Scaffold this active site. Structure first.
Site, PDB file in Angstrom:
ATOM      1  N   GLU A 100      -4.422  35.285  12.066  1.00  0.00           N
ATOM      2  CA  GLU A 100      -5.872  35.280  12.375  1.00  0.00           C
ATOM      3  C   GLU A 100      -6.675  36.274  11.550  1.00  0.00           C
ATOM      4  OE1 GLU A 100      -3.291  35.099  14.766  1.00  0.00           O
ATOM      5  OE2 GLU A 100      -3.674  32.976  14.799  1.00  0.00           O
ATOM      6  N   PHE A 176       5.955  27.446  17.595  1.00  0.00           N
ATOM      7  CA  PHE A 176       5.526  27.569  16.187  1.00  0.00           C
ATOM      8  C   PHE A 176       6.383  28.520  15.418  1.00  0.00           C
ATOM      9  CE2 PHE A 176       1.302  25.865  14.862  1.00  0.00           C
ATOM     10  CZ  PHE A 176       1.441  24.734  15.728  1.00  0.00           C
ATOM     11  N   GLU A 181       7.758  29.096  11.477  1.00  0.00           N
ATOM     12  CA  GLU A 181       7.698  30.425  10.861  1.00  0.00           C
ATOM     13  C   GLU A 181       9.084  30.896  10.416  1.00  0.00           C
ATOM     14  OE1 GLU A 181       5.626  32.389  14.140  1.00  0.00           O
ATOM     15  OE2 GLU A 181       3.716  31.840  13.371  1.00  0.00           O
TER      16      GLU A 181
HETATM   17  N1  CGR Z   1      -5.284  27.022  18.436  1.00  0.00           N
HETATM   18  C1  CGR Z   1      -4.520  27.882  17.780  1.00  0.00           C
HETATM   19  N2  CGR Z   1      -3.256  27.594  17.813  1.00  0.00           N
HETATM   20  C2  CGR Z   1      -2.319  28.327  17.211  1.00  0.00           C
HETATM   21  C3  CGR Z   1      -2.492  29.512  16.440  1.00  0.00           C
HETATM   22  C4  CGR Z   1      -3.936  29.832  16.399  1.00  0.00           C
HETATM   23  O1  CGR Z   1      -4.552  30.764  15.871  1.00  0.00           O
HETATM   24  N3  CGR Z   1      -4.918  29.010  17.062  1.00  0.00           N
HETATM   25  N4  CGR Z   1      -1.129  29.837  16.082  1.00  0.00           N
HETATM   26  C5  CGR Z   1      -0.366  28.854  16.631  1.00  0.00           C
HETATM   27  N5  CGR Z   1      -1.080  27.952  17.298  1.00  0.00           N
HETATM   28  C6  CGR Z   1      -0.777  26.730  18.175  1.00  0.00           C
HETATM   29  O2  CGR Z   1      -1.241  27.386  19.498  1.00  0.00           O
HETATM   30  C7  CGR Z   1      -0.139  27.549  20.427  1.00  0.00           C
HETATM   31  C8  CGR Z   1       0.194  28.994  20.894  1.00  0.00           C
HETATM   32  O3  CGR Z   1       1.618  28.930  21.178  1.00  0.00           O
HETATM   33  P1  CGR Z   1       2.697  30.119  21.653  1.00  0.00           P
HETATM   34  O4  CGR Z   1       3.774  29.454  22.464  1.00  0.00           O
HETATM   35  O5  CGR Z   1       1.898  31.294  22.105  1.00  0.00           O
HETATM   36  O6  CGR Z   1       3.442  30.609  20.291  1.00  0.00           O
HETATM   37  P2  CGR Z   1       3.998  29.698  19.088  1.00  0.00           P
HETATM   38  O7  CGR Z   1       5.192  30.485  18.495  1.00  0.00           O
HETATM   39  O8  CGR Z   1       4.176  28.276  19.571  1.00  0.00           O
HETATM   40  O9  CGR Z   1       2.602  29.915  18.203  1.00  0.00           O
HETATM   41  C9  CGR Z   1       2.139  31.224  17.703  1.00  0.00           C
HETATM   42  C10 CGR Z   1       2.171  31.344  16.144  1.00  0.00           C
HETATM   43  O10 CGR Z   1       1.351  30.405  15.276  1.00  0.00           O
HETATM   44  C11 CGR Z   1      -0.133  30.902  15.193  1.00  0.00           C
HETATM   45  C12 CGR Z   1       0.180  32.456  15.143  1.00  0.00           C
HETATM   46  O11 CGR Z   1       0.356  32.970  13.790  1.00  0.00           O
HETATM   47  C13 CGR Z   1       1.564  32.734  15.865  1.00  0.00           C
HETATM   48  O12 CGR Z   1       2.501  33.595  15.072  1.00  0.00           O
HETATM   49  C14 CGR Z   1       1.116  27.107  19.633  1.00  0.00           C
HETATM   50  O13 CGR Z   1       2.036  26.394  20.483  1.00  0.00           O
HETATM   51  C15 CGR Z   1       0.599  26.158  18.564  1.00  0.00           C
HETATM   52  O14 CGR Z   1       0.475  24.832  19.135  1.00  0.00           O
END
Ligand code: CGR
Ligand code: NGD
Lengths: 253, 252
Positions: A100, A176, A181
């Site tokens: 972000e 994710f 990752e």
């Molecule tokens: N709408 C957004 N979505 C996501 C960002 C983000 O910034 N905005 N994301 C992911 N993501 C999507 O939102 C959820 C949170 O999952 P959650 O279960 O909390 O964690 P994940 O490992 O699945 O996803 C977190 C990962 O990807 C970015 C950020 O750099 C973190 O290291 C995840 O399942 C995805 O479908």
């Protein structure tokens, strides 16, 4: 069954883009070569004139190629289930980078948008709820975002996870992290440092060296990285304590 | 001499649009004026004039256009403690700061100034913050503070540095002293002071003594309630997060 899209998507995108370019993370992340308007064109081409459910991991590939920054060694953080705490700890780039804080992450964070087949090729009033789409479409944008970001990491990387959720394991192959990752960490990565967050006043669920965290330990090691794991290290505990100072875990000497 | 922000209008308008559509939606109202109208008011305050030709009135129209109603009990002021106060206020989730409001968000950290010649602002250089007279140096941020403090309602919070041997926690000539305190209205009920005692540093100022006594006297003279605390636990914990081995942070 529907979600309201962000209004003036182009204006918001371009305005965030210009704000970032001139003023944000100036000493922390490099500028991208492509100008805001070029980035817009790439972004809008990825999803416009397409049914949202037809997108896949490749839809935004060219946009991420244009938007991707070189990332500072040792500073990249990933997070699962702990958005607020991970961002508060990373401290707007000063301690760690999160997705972000990167250009594409910052421009699109919190926004909602959708293509459509009919003109003008996207909908500025209503979008179908994405749960109706196959998973590769739902994850098209943020999935590629994470892959591209993870692929640029070098040195030590940090992964903050929720250790207090009895319904959602700290590490899951289909999160994710697990899907986009970890598999994209290159041989420039040396170590995966896990920080397990135990929420104050909640039963501890996951512990380093057990359950899904042991699965993760084994996988990191099989991928030839170093590994460590800590639960509520002092710096993070103090952060939790600031929002709940009277919690039993926060007692002073 | 300092370096003006590049593409000042593009940045103002980009931050304005970002804020309008996406920022603080659950905590601050939108303003009536559009971003192009706000630019026009902002630009006319300083443009086509010598870079020190300003006073408290120069941005009057901009600030009146940009002013939002503020959440009761949620307003924070600060002096000498930028990072700590912003970290604690936590981008409007606990308190609001000037920098979370529309005009403070747009201009925060930017540098700009007028010149007489076309295009009426100087893209090359601006005067050091000390060459212009005081009413000019304080023209933008002074009036931002005035307008902000005038909109505050209920309890307000003020975070100050109690560890600076060169600068009192409270001064009548700081922005708070000159522009904020004097603009608190009868809608304000209480001034809650938080004194920061930086970790590992000598305490210079304490509640109920020094400049904090001066402040308490003035607050009471305005018929507001007053309290004061030094490193309340929530703030101490924030400080400790960044310096967990400091002696002030030893746990049970
Ligand atoms: N709408 C957004 N979505 C996501 C960002 C983000 O910034 N905005 N994301 C992911 N993501 C999507 O939102 C959820 C949170 O999952 P959650 O279960 O909390 O964690 P994940 O490992 O699945 O996803 C977190 C990962 O990807 C970015 C950020 O750099 C973190 O290291 C995840 O399942 C995805 O479908
Ligand atoms: N975001 C800002 O740039 C800002 C600037 C000035 C004032 N604020 C508001 O007034 C209160 C803070 O000003 P004040 O009480 O004077 O506190 P400080 O002593 O910390 O000064 C505040 C800012 O003023 C900056 N600063 C730096 N140099 C100068 C100067 O030469 N003349 C002048 N007038 N201000 C200067 C300094 O870097 C700080 O970031 C606070 O409640 C906000 O609502 C905010």
């Amino acid at each position: 069954a529907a979600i309201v899209p962000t209004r003036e998507l182009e204006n918001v995108f371009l305005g965030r883009c210009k704000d970032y370019e001139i003023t944000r993370y100036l000493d922390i992340l490099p500028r991208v070569r492509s100008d805001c308007s070029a980035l817009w064109k790439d972004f809008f081409k990825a999803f416009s004139f397409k049914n949202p459910c037809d997108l896949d991991l490749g839809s935004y590939k060219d946009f991420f190629t244009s938007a991707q920054q070189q990332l500072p060694k040792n500073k990249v953080m990933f997070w699962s289930g702990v958005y607020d705490e991970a961002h508060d700890y990373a401290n707007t780039g000063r301690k760690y980078i999160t997705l972000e804080d990167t250009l594409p992450g910052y421009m699109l964070n919190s926004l909602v948008w959708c293509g459509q087949r009919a003109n003008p090729g996207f909908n500025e009033k209503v979008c179908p709820d994405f749960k109706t789409c196959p998973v590769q479409a739902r994850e098209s944008f943020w999935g590629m975002a994470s892959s591209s970001y993870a692929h640029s990491a070098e040195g030590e990387v940090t992964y903050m996870v929720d250790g207090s959720n009895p319904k959602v394991p700290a590490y899951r192959p289909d999160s994710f992290f697990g899907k986009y990752e970890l598999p994209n960490l290159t041989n420039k990565v040396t170590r995966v440092k896990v920080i397990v967050l135990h929420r104050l006043g909640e039963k501890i669920i996951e512990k380093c060296g057990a359950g899904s965290l042991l699965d993760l330990e084994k996988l990191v090691k099989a991928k030839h990285f170093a590994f460590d794991c800590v639960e509520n290290p002092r710096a993070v505990l103090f952060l939790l304590c600031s929002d709940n100072p009277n919690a039993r875990e926060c007692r002073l000497a």
